[PDB]
Amino acid sequence: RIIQTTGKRKTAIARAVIREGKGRVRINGKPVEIIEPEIARFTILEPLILAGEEIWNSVDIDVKVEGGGFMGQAEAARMAIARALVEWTGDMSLKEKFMKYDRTMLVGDPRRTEPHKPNRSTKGPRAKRQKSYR
Amino acid sequence: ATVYDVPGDLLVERVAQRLKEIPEIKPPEWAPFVKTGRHKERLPEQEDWWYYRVASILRRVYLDGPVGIERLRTYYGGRKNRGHAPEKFYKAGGSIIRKALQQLEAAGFVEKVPGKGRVITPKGRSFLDKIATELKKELEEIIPELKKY
Amino acid sequence: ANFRHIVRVAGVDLDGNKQLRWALTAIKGIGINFATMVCRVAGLDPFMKAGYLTDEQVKKIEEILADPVAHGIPRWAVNRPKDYETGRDLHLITAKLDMAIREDIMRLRRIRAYRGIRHELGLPVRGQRTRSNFRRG
Amino acid sequence: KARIKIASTNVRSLDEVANQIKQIAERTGVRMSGPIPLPTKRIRITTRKSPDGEGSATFDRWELRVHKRLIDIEADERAMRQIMRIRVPEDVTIEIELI
Amino acid sequence: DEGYPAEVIEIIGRTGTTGDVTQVKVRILEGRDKGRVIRRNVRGPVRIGDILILRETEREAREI
Amino acid sequence: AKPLNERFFIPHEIKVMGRWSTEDVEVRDPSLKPYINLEPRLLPHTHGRHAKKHFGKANVHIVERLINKIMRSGGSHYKVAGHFMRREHRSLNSKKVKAYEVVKEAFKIIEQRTGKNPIQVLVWAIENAAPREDTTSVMFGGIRYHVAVDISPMRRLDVALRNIALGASAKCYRNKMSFAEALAEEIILAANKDPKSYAYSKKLEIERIAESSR
RNA sequence: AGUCCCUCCCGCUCGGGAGGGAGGCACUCUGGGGGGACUGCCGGCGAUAAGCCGGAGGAAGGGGCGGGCGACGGUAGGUCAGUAUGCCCCGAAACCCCCGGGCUACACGCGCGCUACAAUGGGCGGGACAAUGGGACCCGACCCCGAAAGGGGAAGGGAAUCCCCUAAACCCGCCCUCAGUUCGGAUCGCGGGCUGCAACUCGCCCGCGUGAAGCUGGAAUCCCUAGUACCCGCGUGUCAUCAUCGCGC
């Protein structure tokens, strides 16, 4: 039984494939245990720790992530892994735990960049040039 | 165990130490009097930076191979301090990369793919994989979570 | 070996707490890059603290600075890659460097070149804009 | 094989030509690869509104969108004659090549 | 005396030069005047049921 | 430098940073108890998501609040310790990884030097540095008056965290002390109630002005 | 992503990984048509209406979030130097072309910005992750030459096929330890290149050499309510060369 899931964050798209194995989680082929920085590693690891050791050491996950930055890719992989785990075990209690801990693991993040505008564009939609007044 | 199971820097330093033995990889006569890119302010502070650079180039050919001088230069470029002007990104020099790749080819770790670039040969692949396996065996003791991999 | 607090290399007293790299920079006409170059050609570790230098090593640095090109330094890491008078590659330091620069400025002034005039008036010489900047008075 | 690339500034004309080609293929009985919608090309030009320099700067962004469809068919006499007999409206451009 | 806690039980409205201070009614939880209802001024975002540490429970804020 | 074990630390339980647990952390002030969030949380990083709501930061973990407050320059329109600290390109703004590392080092130093829970010490510092009263201008009739007002629990927490961060920045500014050392020293001093701490000194200043103007 | 074949590598291959072919579109993606969010439901306030506050469900709760569209008029506000145009004027000159110079001058006052006044760092080696857009006298992978700038040949691409294009901030390891310093990079000397018919007035780049104020800024004053502000880089418009700029990512 091979299960596929998707996660999206900003411009980061992650496709996660989960199957039966020993507990090998790889992000782009590189083990999750040596993810740098620790901030991104913790973001990726949180859902597995929440699920528990038993489920963690019972599935193998391979995640391919493209686009975004080192945090966007990590969060997209987090979402994909959370969804894959939830759909694989089919545990409503686990889904409820995930929802109470962080609604965003299963539900995506709609937030995107707001297009820039004139009057000192290239800085932000609302950033404006200083006015002389005299 | 392979390259993908080992941190890049810990593997690169070990590969440099091992490559110091091979006689086909020697610093050029102009190595002591050169910087590593027009964007760099001061020349290296290692006295053996040649082996580290060659190891990095070999690992790059292993991972993203086939590749070429221009793309490796893009990788090895970086930000420059232009003074009062805003900072900007520039590429790196080409002689260092070209000589490193030629020395690797002479050693037999890389080979030319015509019109595409340079790709790692089985000999170099085995060399890198052996170094990575040794490093992973060393690391497994500190980090038990890497045993299953 | 003897650890001298202050050492003399080229008529300038260098510190003893700094590495040879940054110690050699106290001499006018030698920057960090050229100091590392000279240390490497002489064969000394650039990172050794100044003061451990011996008389033989100081003498080696002496004639290295006297004629860097003939002893391995590249032809393009020199203060005067092509001298106006001799036409050779010469590296100058302190008094000789100042004399050469003054000779060049006096050359421009004597020949009445635009740069010579700008040097005399003290205004910027490399075609900058004087409307809003370079306000000294 | 024959590859046809059809591009226009009007989605309705684009779809009309695509439907005509699909009907021709269906009536001839030849298997046809569905219309591939290639990414739209958006030419954007930002221009200052004022003809002079006075006043706060304001800009307008004029955009021209061009839509592209691709179709692949297997060459046949009747099918290719019928395709060459296409209407090809004024605002649509058609290119045919053989492989 | 380390302050006295009082629970906010009703909000009157906003007040101040820039409308920063909210007038509320508070019941004293502990102290010599336990259970007394007073009207006091509050600075910052305040809800119902919040606990405010008043240094003293003598003065009462003026009406809106 | 640091051990490979610390470099590749792998948590296995749900606790703050994967190293310290808040089960034993105790908050006394009844005013501030409903607003100091101590729920289980491995990574204190919510990617905002609480600004949209009102009182939405009352459910953000205290360590995340501290990291956000530390992520700043120090001063741009207000003078800190009689100086400005306008760090333009070297500030920690938009560097949550750097703020996170600094807070981790500060907590490690606090635990090493005190022997107690760093989060408990931080809680104590907040309790000690939270002011209880202030003053403001209120207009009745046709003129203004300098009246005395109370501070709501959320404003108290905000002031305490702000003062702690500002004190750490001031201590670290152009000094041999690193940012982590400055933050640890500031937190410990605030916990110990020593007036040297910027947080405690500013709290006492606000308190005395409010008492005088009441 | 699953499945078959070939090749290679590792702990000697149980097991794991990479690439190429067949094959698939399963996921991402592109782009056409549709659904969904409607105070629709619950509690309260208001008067039973207009409506307002909170709550459940939900991706999106109250104009869903950001933009385009600027009313009758005024402002004798700006534009005849973008084109059109009344009147006045030159009409062989104020018309039309060629070289050279100027718009780039510099005791000084001002606006908006860049770099900085350091450890919330500088340097050195190594390790990661984007998007928007453009390409015919054009983009140019790839190989050889050079220390850098740059030079020679040249595949592919009128474009989801090739290229611009392996960004920086960030993370690791080492040196520096509070100092006008290994901070700061103005200002000049020498030498090597590129564009261009032409580089001195008056271009940009590169190596070595020197190292000017500046150690946080009075009165006063500016922008910003959420992926927004702040930091970090990149695309394009101008272009033979030149971006501390505008518009975007």
Side-chain angles (χ1 to χ4, degrees), chain B residues 58-105:
Chain B
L58 185 56
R59 183 170 171 283
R60 294 261 63 98
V61 168
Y62 172 96
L63 282 181
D64 313 341
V67 277
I69 307 308
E70 305 297 328
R71 301 172 184 292
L72 289 172
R73 284 169 71 206
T74 296
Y75 175 80
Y76 288 119
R79 201 170 57 158
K80 178 173 196 199
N81 189 1
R82 295 161 81 217
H84 279 171
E87 298 85 326
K88 169 180 183 182
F89 174 94
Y90 294 69
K91 288 189 185 195
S95 286
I96 289 162
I97 295 155
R98 196 167 75 266
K99 292 307 193 304
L101 286 171
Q102 289 185 5
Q103 282 180 12
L104 288 164
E105 199 211 324

Side-chain angles (χ1 to χ4, degrees), chain C residues 7-20:
Chain C
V7 161
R8 172 142 298 157
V9 198
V12 162
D13 280 285
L14 301 195
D15 204 330
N17 63 3
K18 310 210 309 217
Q19 305 158 7
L20 191 54

Side-chain angles (χ1 to χ4, degrees), chain A residues 28-35 37-97:
Chain A
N28 260 301
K30 153 172 156 59
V32 79
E33 318 297 355
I34 47 151
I35 290 306
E38 188 211 299
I39 196 89
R41 187 162 72 239
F42 278 26
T43 43
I44 298 178
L45 258 295
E46 203 147 357
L48 305 152
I49 294 143
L50 263 164
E53 248 292 275
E54 292 47 17
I55 308 192
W56 190 359
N57 296 118
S58 300
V59 310
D60 280 2
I61 312 178
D62 213 318
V63 190
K64 299 290 187 293
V65 202
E66 259 95 20
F70 79 99
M71 278 293 301
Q73 304 216 6
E75 218 169 333
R78 174 183 183 170
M79 266 144 216
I81 291 162
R83 281 166 181 170
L85 295 174
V86 152
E87 181 216 273
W88 170 273
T89 166
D91 182 348
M92 285 321 89
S93 67
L94 165 70
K95 151 145 172 109
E96 158 284 330
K97 179 169 66 171

Side-chain angles (χ1 to χ4, degrees), chain C residues 33-79:
Chain C
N33 283 6
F34 197 79
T36 311
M37 248 171 255
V38 89
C39 290
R40 281 176 183 182
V41 57
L44 330 171
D45 178 6
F47 269 74
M48 61 149 83
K49 304 187 79 153
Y52 292 78
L53 268 190
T54 66
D55 271 323
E56 40 286 60
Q57 303 178 329
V58 173
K59 181 64 66 176
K60 197 70 172 23
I61 298 175
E62 289 265 23
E63 69 299 37
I64 279 293
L65 287 192
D67 185 339
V69 165
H71 289 187
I73 300 269
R75 207 153 316 236
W76 37 265
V78 157
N79 294 348

Side-chain angles (χ1 to χ4, degrees), chain C residues 19 21-22 27-31 33-34 76-82 97 104 107 115 118-119 123-126 128-132 134-137:
Chain C
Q19 305 158 7
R21 321 190 279 133
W22 295 113
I27 308 168
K28 243 200 70 167
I30 292 170
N33 283 6
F34 197 79
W76 37 265
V78 157
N79 294 348
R80 313 258 300 182
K82 215 152 68 175
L97 183 67
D104 288 323
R107 188 168 77 66
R115 284 205 284 148
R118 299 297 288 190
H119 267 124
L123 302 159
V125 202
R126 277 156 190 210
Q128 289 102 299
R129 267 181 189 222
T130 68
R131 162 68 165 270
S132 193
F134 308 89
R135 292 193 173 169
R136 59 102 180 166

Side-chain angles (χ1 to χ4, degrees), chain C residues 101-134:
Chain C
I101 291 175
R102 220 169 294 134
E103 176 32 286
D104 288 323
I105 287 150
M106 284 339 293
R107 188 168 77 66
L108 298 174
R109 295 176 41 152
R110 183 192 333 143
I111 219 66
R112 301 277 75 210
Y114 171 84
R115 284 205 284 148
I117 282 76
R118 299 297 288 190
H119 267 124
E120 279 173 13
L121 296 80
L123 302 159
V125 202
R126 277 156 190 210
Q128 289 102 299
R129 267 181 189 222
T130 68
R131 162 68 165 270
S132 193
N133 288 320
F134 308 89

Side-chain angles (χ1 to χ4, degrees), chain A residues 2 4 6 8-11 13 15 17 19 24 26 37 62 66-70 73 103 107 110-121 124-133:
Chain A
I2 283 64
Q4 300 194 61
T6 299
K8 298 166 97 162
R9 186 80 166 73
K10 297 179 184 184
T11 66
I13 303 128
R15 328 179 202 154
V17 192
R19 71 186 58 195
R24 303 190 270 247
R26 300 191 122 97
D62 213 318
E66 259 95 20
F70 79 99
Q73 304 216 6
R103 261 169 50 96
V107 181
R111 293 187 291 179
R112 254 74 162 171
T113 59
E114 166 172 353
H116 290 187
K117 267 150 263 301
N119 186 339
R120 219 74 184 99
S121 100
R126 297 116 177 288
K128 307 221 184 24
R129 202 185 91 159
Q130 199 187 348
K131 198 158 70 168
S132 176
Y133 277 82

